[PDB]
Design a protein around this ligand. Structure first.
Ligand SMILES: CCCCCCCCCCCCCCCCCC(=O)OC[C@H](COP(=O)(O)OCCN)OC(=O)CCCCCCCCCCCCCCCCC
Ligand SMILES: CCCCCCCCCCCCCCCCCCCC
Ligand code: SF4
Lengths: 198, 314, 60, 101, 149, 100
């Protein structure tokens, strides 16, 4: 199942157009360029993921552009403060299609622990979000797992190949949640190591 | 339609086309190799998951640049904004156009050569100036003025660095320059010419440590044009240094193209090492190094080369 | 600048060149995520569960 | 000589294919994908580049024919390079090439 | 409790100082050693993960003590980290902090004396760089810092 | 196989175009542009004359001509910068305070 942005609409996908959309999706997931935007702690773990021990570069996401026009993905990693929310909105509007959003950490997810007068309670209040990571902060490999989640969501989305022909609306698949996908193996856990050891 | 002249025309045009395609693909794959070698230099692996050895990453970047939405500022001048990546690509491409890769494999056997490289360097600084002005941005304009002043400050002695090599060779032709290296490579007499040409060639390609930017407004395939043009420029500078200081294709055992490609790859890896290791000197220090130190060194090197080549001309 | 300062600068840059090359000749310290699973200590604060008693009923 | 005209044609198709490849690369980038006061030191640096580039072209003309010009050409270019270095030292000392204050 | 709190505070101080030095080296223009500094921070994070269960915000100190006891094997990880650190510190110093370009970019920039630090409430490395030997761990000892050499 | 006359006509056309641009334009930058057009046209004529006779003297005086053009353009652009610095406008009709 898919949803439209110009409602729920089924999968429309000639085989040559299907292969062309598949290769466009492949090139888009295998080359995702994040934007160098810093808000708070979660950006420190973001640049931790970019470093040598973690090596985001294996995903081809180390290019890390300093201008939003050159970036494909916006990782909101930190708290959406009231003063910083117009900056976030302007930065997201400066981007070009296609543009996806990864919300990193509890602050960008929902406001986190900061149910306070000067914090916007979640970045999804004003900009659309594609992936959410719980954490405070998420570890760098959780950001990597979200990068693969965004790759999976990218690889089965439908976008126009050009503006001269075809439908110009975007089709994002209603993905099965990771919670119900991993519930089979998460409940089967029986014993864990006791916290008194290393 | 079978004649030796016409088939020679067609085969030589095919060699030129093959050289052009290999050069543009080598620049793109060596940008990918720049990422990989930076990862190696900082104890990582770099892009190695998209394809066998990461070789399919570049196709993914090309697809992303091609299918990105094309964006031009409304207030900007469209013609200059379009034209600046065109120049930044083509200038260093036709700068490569003089390089002899192997005996019997050349594009144009000109009577000028490195003069044509100098014209292409002037066109490169034109590309930087046009990219800065066309953005309709004061910050990018000022940054382009600074970058263009630096490029001028090193282009002012690029040719004088090459002057010792052509003075020993006795001709502007590149084949004669290589053939003068049949017994000793030009790096040994023109050591100062070599280091000054290396510094100038790094600076005119805006490679580290010589890099309010003038690339902020560019996006889509124009930014990819800038990258492939600058990396083709890295290829061109490396091949020029090989063919002017390290004997070109001359080698004892291996085929000449193998030796030429090995030396070019060594200089490419050296450029990646320069990018990885050195910190960035300040702008005033960079231009004072360009004017005060290297240009008198090239002048004195040319004078000493002339005196030596007249002493041995008994 | 002075010639001694220039020679010291050239020496420091060549030393940085050599040290970065020696870093290149070293051993990688990169964890191969997701292919290599992340080791986590037993008291690592990640996903929350509700557990059971040894008899099999839920402990809450 | 068919080799000379062959090399001329190779240069022609090299130029044409390079420019056209960049043209069609820009065309394909545009076509595909959906949509939804400066100081006078700049002038001084460019001016110094122009003047020293003309003196550089004089040295370019010198260096290609050093051997048959003899030692007289060497002493002539020695006066030339000494004049260039005197002007360069003069420019350096007064602060023309000093960007920092 | 005092020695545990001092150990955790010193581990996090080393983490923060490593980040500060690496970010300064990157901001000057040498972007290489921040990666290795983050590897050292990852070793510190390994020890902090083992002890407190979290990487960056442990939430481990309690009113009257700490949340858990020290896990069996904390001393091995601490010994491995203490063997790891000095060679990396010397490597970063000789690769970047003794290089001339960073010294020229850093020396003589935004200097001030003791009076400017006193009147503006400057503390930490700046105040002691002005020659005033005022550290809280020595002047007003806390958490058993008087038992450390 | 290429007439000397045709190159001379081309150089003369460029010269009169530069002179017309020098006369009709009252912005100082376009006057300097016209000056470089005329001096380049005369240099082109000199190169054509040298190539007709098979002598290097045409290229030698071309080298002298472009040296003069470079230095004169530098001086003229310095004067233009001074005019724009002190008067904030590039009207060549504004510099008319000496007359009679
Ligand atoms: C946006 C487009 C702008 C314009 C771009 C160019 C448009 C034209 C493209 C088609 C050109 C067709 C072929 C032209 C002739 C090529 C061969 C040639 O030049 O031969 C003449 C000469 C031969 O010399 P040689 O080989 O030594 O022969 C021995 C003596 N018989 O060899 C020479 O004299 C070599 C020296 C001349 C080489 C000229 C190369 C092009 C110069 C202009 C580049 C412009 C780049 C784009 C714009 C940059 C920004 C302004
Ligand atoms: C970085 C190097 C870029 C080189 C660009 C041009 C490549 C030309 C390749 C020519 C190959 C044939 C050379 C002559 C025959 C001898 C070798 C035969 C096996 C390749
Ligand atoms: S979620 Fe936690 S770690 Fe992330 S920005 Fe908020 S307070 Fe910091």
């Amino acid at each position: 199942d898919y949803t439209l942005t110009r409602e729920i609409v089924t999968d429309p996908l000639n085989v040559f157009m299907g292969k062309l959309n598949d290769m466009v999706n492949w090139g888009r997931k295998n080359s995702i360029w994040p934007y160098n935007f810093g808000l708070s702690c979660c950006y420190v773990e973001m640049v931790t993921s970019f470093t040598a021990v973690h090596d985001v570069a294996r995903f081809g996401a180390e290019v890390l552009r300093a201008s939003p026009r050159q970036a494909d993905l916006m990782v909101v990693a930190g708290t959406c403060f009231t003063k910083m929310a117009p900056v976030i909105q302007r930065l997201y509007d400066q981007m070009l299609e296609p543009k996806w959003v990864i919300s990193m950490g509890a602050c960008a997810n929902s406001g986190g622990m900061y149910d306070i007068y000067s914090v916007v309670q979640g970045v999804d209040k004003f900009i659309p979000v594609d992936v959410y990571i719980p954490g405070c902060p998420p570890r760098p490999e959780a950001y990597m797992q979200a990068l693969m989640l965004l790759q999976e969501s990218i690889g089965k989305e439908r976008r126009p190949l050009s503006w001269v022909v075809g439908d110009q609306g975007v089709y994002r698949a209603n993905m099965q949640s990771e919670r119900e996908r991993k519930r089979g193996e998460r409940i089967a856990v029986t014993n864990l190591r006791t916290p008194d050891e290393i | 339609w079978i004649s030796p002249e016409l088939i020679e025309i067609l085969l030589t045009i095919l060699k030129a086309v093959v050289i052009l395609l290999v050069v543009v693909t080598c620049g793109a794959f060596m940008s990918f190799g720049e990422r990989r070698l930076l990862g190696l230099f900082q104890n990582r692996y770099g892009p190695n998951r998209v394809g066998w050895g990461g070789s399919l990453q570049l196709v993914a970047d090309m697809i992303k640049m091609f299918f990105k939405e094309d964006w031009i500022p409304k207030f900007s001048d469209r013609v200059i904004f379009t034209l600046a990546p065109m120049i930044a690509f083509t200038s260093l491409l036709l700068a490569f156009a003089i390089v002899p890769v192997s005996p019997g494999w050349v594009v144009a056997d000109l009577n000028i050569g490195i003069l044509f490289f100098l014209m292409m360097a002037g066109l490169a600084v034109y590309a930087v100036l046009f990219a800065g002005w066309s953005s309709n941005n004061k910050y990018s304009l000022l940054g382009a003025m600074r970058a263009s002043a630096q490029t001028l400050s090193y282009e002012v002695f690029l040719g004088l660095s090459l002057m010792g090599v052509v003075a020993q060779a006795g001709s502007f032709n590149m084949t004669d320059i290589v053939n003068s290296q049949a017994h000793v490579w030009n790096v040994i007499p023109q050591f100062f010419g070599f280091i000054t040409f290396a510094i100038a060639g790094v600076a005119v390609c805006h490679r580290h440590p010589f890099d309010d930017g003038y690339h902020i407004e560019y996006s889509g395939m124009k930014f990819g044009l800038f990258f492939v043009g600058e990396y083709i420029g890295i290829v061109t500078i490396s091949a020029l240094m090989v063919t002017l200081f390290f004997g070109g294709w001359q080698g004892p055992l291996l085929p000449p193209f193998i030796w030429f490609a090995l030396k070019t790859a060594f200089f490419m890896m050296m450029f990646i090492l320069i990018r990885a290791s050195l910190p960035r000197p300040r702008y005033d220090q960079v231009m004072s190094f360009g004017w005060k130190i290297c240009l008198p060194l090239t002048l004195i090197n040319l004078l000493v080369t002339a005196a030596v080549i007249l002493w041995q001309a008994q | 600048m002075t010639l001694k300062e220039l020679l010291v600068g050239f020496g420091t840059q060549v030393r940085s060149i050599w040290m970065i090359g020696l870093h290149a000749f070293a051993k990688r310290e990169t964890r191969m995520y997701p292919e290599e699973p992340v080791y986590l200590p037993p008291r690592y604060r990640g996903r929350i569960v509700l557990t059971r008693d040894p008899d099999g009923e839920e402990r809450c | 000589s068919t080799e000379v005209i062959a090399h001329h044609w190779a240069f022609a198709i090299f130029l044409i294919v390079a420019i056209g490849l960049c043209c069609l690369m820009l065309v394909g980038g545009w076509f595909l994908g959906g949509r939804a006061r400066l100081s006078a030191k700049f002038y001084l640096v460019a001016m110094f580049f122009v003047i020293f580039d003309v003196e550089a072209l004089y040295l370019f003309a010198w260096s290609t024919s050093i051997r048959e010009s003899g030692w007289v050409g060497f002493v002539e270019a020695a006066i030339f390079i000494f004049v260039l270095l005197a002007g360069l030292v003069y420019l350096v000392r007064i602060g023309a090439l000093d960007w920092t204050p | 409790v005092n020695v545990i709190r001092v150990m955790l505070s010193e581990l996090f101080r080393i983490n923060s100082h490593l980040l500060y030095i690496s970010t300064f080296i990157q901001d000057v223009g040498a972007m290489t050693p921040v990666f290795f500094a983050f590897t050292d921070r990852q070793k510190i994070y390994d020890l902090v993960e083992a002890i407190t269960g979290f990487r960056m915000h442990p939430a481990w100190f309690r009113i009257g003590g700490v949340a858990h006891d020290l896990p069996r094997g904390w001393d091995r990880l601490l010994r491995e980290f203490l063997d790891w650190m000095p060679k990396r510190l010397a490597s970063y110093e000789k690769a970047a902090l003794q290089n001339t370009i960073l010294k020229g970019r850093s020396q003589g920039v935004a200097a001030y004396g003791a009076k400017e630090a006193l009147e503006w409430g400057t503390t930490g490395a700046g105040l002691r760089a002005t020659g005033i030997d005022f550290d809280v761990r020595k002047a007003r000892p806390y958490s058993g810092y008087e038992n450390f050499d | 196989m290429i007439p000397l006359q045709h190159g001379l006509i081309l150089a003369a056309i460029l010269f009169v175009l530069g002179l017309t641009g020098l006369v009709i334009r009252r912005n100082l930058l376009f006057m300097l542009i016209g000056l470089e057009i005329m001096i380049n046209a005369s240099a082109l004529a000199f190169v054509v004359a040298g190539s007709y006779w098979g002598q290097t003297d045409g290229q030698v005086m071309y080298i002298l001509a472009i040296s003069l053009a470079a230095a004169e353009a530098s001086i003229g652009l310095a004067l233009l910068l001074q005019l724009h610095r002190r008067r904030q406008n590039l009207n060549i009709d504004s510099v008319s305070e000496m007359r009679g």
